[PDB]
Design a protein around this ligand. Structure first.
Ligand code: SF4
Ligand code: SF4
Lengths: 104, 353, 384, 166, 180
């Protein structure tokens, strides 16, 4: 729900929105715009950055935009005085050539 | 002695020799009881094989200790290394022959001590400085500043407590008007056992002797299953055994003195059984500490330093002073009796809520 | 000075190399240096089957083994959409909570051992044995288990399981109390613990701490409530909480948990009756072996299952769960092979360790030992 | 110069050595948690010459290499081994150590025996505590020289002359 | 505070006089449950015919790859197992055996059935890759146990008991509360 004001935004910014029928969601971003976007989220009341899973798609039986892909899991702890349980992933495909990305 | 026996140089020697090795065998079988009594205490079977009751296991242990490398490591000096345990054991051994074992001229008619002096208290007090010497020396010897630092803690603390023991021993000297053991014993022979007379001095003494090396403040860092004492872990074989040995010898020495002091060792108007009565008092306190030792914790020396220094020692000399007032005007000693008893009663009542 | 506390010491048995910047009488900061063990399970398991991976799951949690296992199980189960019988699910919670108790037993056992008085450990261990005896019964294994199987556990409970289970629930309340009895009074207990273990709730999240650290600071955050997963929805129980980050608080929490766990057991026993123990879709489940005798199609599927093992469809999956040790979860990408294309493990304790230089700011030197211990290191999280 | 070379001495001393075994465990695995179990609480070890159960080689010479290990641990362990006194025994406890169980990987070290010589293997991860008891009974009679191999072949009464001792 | 300290002692003292709860090994047999997993036994029929056919299903199951199995086709006149295939070599490296148990589950002959053994430990690497004939339902101990029992001339024991056999085993009778 905290999520939703992110979602309309994401849609507005045209970011592709992955969804598994298991109700897991990724948001496909470029590298550049990430940091700030993600800044805005914490501000928007995102409690808890749970994960960073680095992905190697060296060999995959389908095409992907990039070989290296990061994925953040952000969460809103509802058991905290703020939060809604709003948990979602952000995926960001990553050039192999530059293994860079601004921290969080 | 000005009214007490003497015996040949030879007989003196024999008694000494015996008493030394007696305390070896003592230490051995003490370990056994400690191990087994520990097991049982924490509902467990123990040494029972190689015995029966693990009897011969200490032999094995000793034998293990020998036939080993026993070397000095680089960045230490040889002489110091050798001396540093040595010292501690000599002076641990030393001081026990002072104390009796029974009524006068009654160790088969021969005197029930190995030395007896005329100056009891002093000797004890004096010996108390010399163990800690061994300790810190070892630290330094080892050449790890890690070892050293532990030893500094140790010694510092020990020495702090050492002083309170001093303030304790004045008090009975008042009462008897003397410091030799025999007379002191005999004082209780008429009036009764000395803790009656001065329960808080009994008390404060008791808890100060805890503060002896005895594995019973039970952090120091002690060695065996914590951050270690620096008098160990930079040691090897037999030398290591010696240190361990020493700690225990202290333990029992202290356990003996407390009977000496507050009871007579073998005074008991009910019956005279010399040797028996000695052991029984020993036994009591022995177990008593061990029960504490078990069921109570490792104590940060930080806490301890705060604890003894600020509260415990000042209250002990305070009690002395009071008693000195009474004694100076030489008033009914009944007058202390009430109070001693009461203070305990107070401080006992204080436990529960 | 920068003091170097190396691995395997003294009986704290983290691989721990610790650079303690000291004032020579205080701790300033610790730069922990770790990672002296590691495997790369995550790698290896892409080179084993899904079935096989279940071997790996309890092999990185000495404590609550079954939780890892469960969490991994769930993830798979979700992915191909498989369901689990109610009775199965009953059993699963029972084992889980039994394993939680185990964990706690070990936590406090070590707590005592680490420092403070040594002995009560042995009593807590007596109980642990009892627990172990229960595990032995049902899984033939002291610990590590495979009883849980896909679709639900792989065979029925012992009858023998019922007597003993009651039995130990009788004894434990009283026992639990008596361990607790050692702590809350002992004014020395106070003087060793209360002041230390500090960290703001705010920073607990920033540096990442998980329940029984976070909830050790009394911040309600049961993942079993927040993302309630199976059965727990329909089980009452409450959250045990502290109200500040200290050792002191932690310790008491755990005791309360155990009691909650026991009530859940109690609840469970009521809800227990006959039923199939795993999913009866033989496509996705290995078939009963009492039927090889019978059909070919059985034989075929059987053979196949235990050789090749199925193909789940393509997908990533994650489920958050509440382990004993905190936020647990597996992020699993499968490419639809017979092995996954990614096994990410969410290891809580590892993240919880990040908060150590913080946790151990400006502390006192004998205290620093305990402050590590109090947080609970299982090195598997860290090392992986 | 170690208690041998008269009928008497060697049996004597060997009994001494054999019966006083002081375990230093080298946990880094699940083994440890079973090891604390292995100590107490069902069975004892104090009746096998053990109050030593703890981390000083300054207290022990019985090396129990207990658990699956990595590359990073090899020189460490080596050195720890070295900082023991001259006679010393190597138990290789459990599968995880002994040949690397179910891991074939760069990270890990397989066949712990690589790092230091061994005299006793005791498989199983987990094993039973009791197996370890059986193992030390072995090790007892092994250092007693009343042992062989499964081909009847005798062997030294120590682990420590299979590669260099120090 | 202070009260507790006393209470602490109290309970422990109770326990002191309590006669303990521990069991000596190997002087009262360890208590095991029938599902317990010891050393694998290779079973046979009352037809005196080994169940295993060198099914080698296990081998796909073993993540450790702990099984070296040379197969063979049975004698037609004297088949060592009724089947047309058997295990001409059956080796297990116990040094890394997973004792999968899944092993058992895959084997269709039910050849492999975990034992109640654990009394295994020896000094030599290559002795601990237990062979076929050590892995039967017909041996009377562990390899070192047995090897000891010949040189010593002593008999056997194994120091465990279960409540009763596991149904899976149906050959060998173990000590069960009534043996040791
Ligand atoms: S053999 Fe098993 S119990 Fe031992 S360290 Fe390896 S995985 Fe753990
Ligand atoms: S033991 Fe069973 S699974 Fe293994 S080869 Fe024999 S019949 Fe096949």
């Amino acid at each position: 729900m905290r999520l939703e004001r992110v979602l309309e935004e994401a849609r507005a910014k045209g970011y592709p929105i992955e969804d598994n029928g298991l109700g897991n969601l990724w948001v496909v971003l470029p590298r550049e715009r990430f940091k700030e976007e993600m800044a805005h989220y914490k501000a928007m009341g995102f409690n808890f950055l749970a994960d960073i899973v680095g992905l190697d798609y060296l060999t995959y039986p389908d095409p992907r935009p990039e070989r290296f892909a990061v994925v953040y899991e952000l969460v809103s702890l509802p058991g905290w005085k703020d939060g809604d349980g709003s948990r979602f992933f952000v995926r960001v495909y990553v050039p192999e050539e530059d293994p860079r990305l601004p921290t969080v | 002695t000005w009214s007490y026996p003497v015996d040949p140089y030879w007989m003196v020697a024999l008694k000494a020799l015996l008493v030394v090795v007696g305390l070896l065998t003592a230490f051995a079988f003490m370990t056994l009881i400690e191990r087994r009594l520990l097991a049982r205490f924490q509902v467990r079977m123990g040494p029972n094989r190689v015995g029966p009751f693990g009897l011969l296991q200490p032999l094995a242990d000793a034998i293990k200790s020998i036939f080993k490398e026993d070397i000095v490591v680089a960045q230490a000096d040889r002489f110091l290394f050798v001396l540093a345990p040595l010292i501690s054991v000599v002076f641990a051994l030393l001081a026990f022959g002072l104390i009796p074992f029974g009524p006068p001229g009654s160790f088969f008619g021969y005197q029930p001590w190995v030395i007896n002096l005329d100056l009891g208290i002093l000797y004890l007090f004096a010996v108390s400085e010399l163990a800690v010497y061994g300790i810190f020396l070892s630290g330094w010897a080892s050449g790890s500043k890690y070892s050293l630092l532990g030893s500094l803690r140790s010694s510092a603390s020990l020495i702090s407590y050492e002083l309170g023991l001093g303030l304790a021993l004045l008090a009975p000297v008042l009462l008897v008007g003397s410091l030799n053991l025999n007379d002191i014993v005999n004082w209780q022979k008429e009036h009764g056992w000395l803790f009656l007379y001065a329960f808080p001095a009994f008390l404060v003494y008791l808890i100060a002797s805890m503060a002896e090396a005895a594995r019973t403040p039970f952090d120091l860092p002690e060695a065996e299953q914590e951050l270690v004492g620096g008098y160990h872990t930079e040691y090897s074989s037999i030398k290591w055994a010696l240190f361990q040995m020493a700690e225990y010898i202290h333990f029992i020495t202290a356990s003996a003195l407390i009977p000496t002091l507050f009871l007579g060792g073998w005074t008991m108007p009910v019956l005279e059984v010399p040797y028996l009565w000695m052991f029984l008092k020993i036994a009591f306190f022995l177990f008593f500490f061990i029960w504490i030792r078990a069921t109570w914790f490792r104590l940060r020396y930080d806490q301890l330093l705060r604890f003894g220094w600020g509260f415990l020692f000042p209250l002990a000399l305070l009690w002395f002073l009071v008693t000195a007032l009474v004694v100076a005007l030489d008033l009914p000693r009944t007058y202390l009796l009430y109070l001693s008893a009461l203070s305990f009663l107070v401080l006992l009542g204080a436990v529960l809520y | 000075m920068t003091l170097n506390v190396g691995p395997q010491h003294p009986s704290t048995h983290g691989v721990l190399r610790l650079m303690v910047t000291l004032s020579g009488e205080e701790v300033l900061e610790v730069v922990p240096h770790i990672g002296y063990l590691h495997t790369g399970f995550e790698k290896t398991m892409e080179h084993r089957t899904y079935l096989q991976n279940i071997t790996y799951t309890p092999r990185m949690d000495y404590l609550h083994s079954f939780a890892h296992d469960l969490a991994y199980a769930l993830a798979v189960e979700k992915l191909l959409g498989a369901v689990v019988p109610p009775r199965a699910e009953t059993i699963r919670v029972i084992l889980n909570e039994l394993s939680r108790l185990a964990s706690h037993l070990v936590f406090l056992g070590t707590g005592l051992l680490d420092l403070g008085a040594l002995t009560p450990f042995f009593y807590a261990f007596r109980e642990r044995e009892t627990i172990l005896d229960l595990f032995e019964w049902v899984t033939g294994q002291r610990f590590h288990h495979n009883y849980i199987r896909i679709g639900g556990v792989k065979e029925d409970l012992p009858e023998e399981f019922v007597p003993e289970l009651k039995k130990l629930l009788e004894v434990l309340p009283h026992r639990i109390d008596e361990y607790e009895a050692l702590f809350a009074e002992s004014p020395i207990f106070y003087e060793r613990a209360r002041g230390v273990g500090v960290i703001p709730p705010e920073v607990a999240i920033d540096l990442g701490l998980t329940g029984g650290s976070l909830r050790a600071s009394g911040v309600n955050y049961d993942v079993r409530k927040a993302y309630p997963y199976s059965g727990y929805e329909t089980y009452t129980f409450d959250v045990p909480l502290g109200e500040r980050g200290d050792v002191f608080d932690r310790m008491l929490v755990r005791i309360r948990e155990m009691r909650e766990s026991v009530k859940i057991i109690k609840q469970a026993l009521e809800r227990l009756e006959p039923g199939p123990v795993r999913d009866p879709n033989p496509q996705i489940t290995p078939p009963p072996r009492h039927l090889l005798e019978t059909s070919m199609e059985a034989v075929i599927y059987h053979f196949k299952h235990y050789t090749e093992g199925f193909h789940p469809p393509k997908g990533e999956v994650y489920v958050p769960t509440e382990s004993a040790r905190g936020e647990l979860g597996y992020y699993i990408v499968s490419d639809g092979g017979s092995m996954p294309y990614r096994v990410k493990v969410r290891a809580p304790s590892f993240v919880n360790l990040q908060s150590l230089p913080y946790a151990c700011k400006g502390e006192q030197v004998p205290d620093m030992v305990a402050i590590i211990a109090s947080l609970d290191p299982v090195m598997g999280d860290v090392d992986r | 110069r170690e208690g041998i070379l008269f009928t008497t001495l060697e049996k004597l001393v060997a009994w001494g050595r054999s019966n006083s075994l002081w375990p230093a465990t080298f946990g880094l695995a699940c083994c440890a948690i079973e090891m604390m179990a292995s100590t107490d609480a069902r069975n004892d070890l104090a009746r096998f010459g053990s109050e030593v159960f703890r981390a000083s080689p300054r207290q022990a010479d019985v090396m129990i290499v207990a658990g699956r290990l990595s590359k990073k641990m090899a020189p460490v362990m080596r050195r720890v081994w070295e900082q023991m006194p001259d006679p010393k025994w190597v138990i290789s406890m459990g599968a995880c150590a002994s040949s690397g169980g179910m891991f074939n990987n760069y990270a890990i070290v397989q066949n712990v025996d690589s790092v230091v010589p061994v005299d006793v293997y005791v498989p199983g991860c987990p094993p039973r505590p009791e197996a370890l008891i059986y193992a030390v009974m072995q090790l007892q009679k092994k250092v007693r020289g009343q042992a062989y191999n499964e081909r009847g072949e005798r062997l030294p009464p120590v682990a420590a002359w299979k590669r260099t001792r120090g | 505070t202070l009260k507790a300290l006393a209470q602490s002692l109290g309970i422990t003292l109770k326990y002191l006089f309590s006669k303990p709860v521990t069991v000596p090994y190997p002087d009262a047999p360890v208590a095991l449950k029938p599902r317990f997993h010891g050393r694998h036994v290779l079973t046979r029929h009352p037809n005196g015919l080994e169940k295993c056919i060198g099914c080698s299903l296990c081998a796909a199951a073993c993540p450790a790859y702990a099984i070296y199995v040379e197969p063979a086709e049975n004698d037609p006149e004297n088949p060592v197992s009724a089947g047309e295939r058997y295990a001409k070599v059956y080796e297990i490296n116990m040094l890394r055996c997973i004792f999968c148990g899944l092993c058992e589950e895959a084997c269709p002959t039910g050849a492999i059935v975990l034992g109640y053994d654990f009394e295994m430990a020896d000094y030599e690497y290559s002795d601990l890759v237990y062979g076929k004939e050590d892995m039967l339902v017909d041996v009377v101990g562990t390899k070192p146990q047995r090897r000891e029992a010949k040189r010593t001339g002593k008999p056997v024991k194994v120091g465990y008991v279960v409540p009763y056999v596991r149904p899976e085993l149906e050959g060998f009778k173990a000590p069960t509360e009534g043996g040791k």
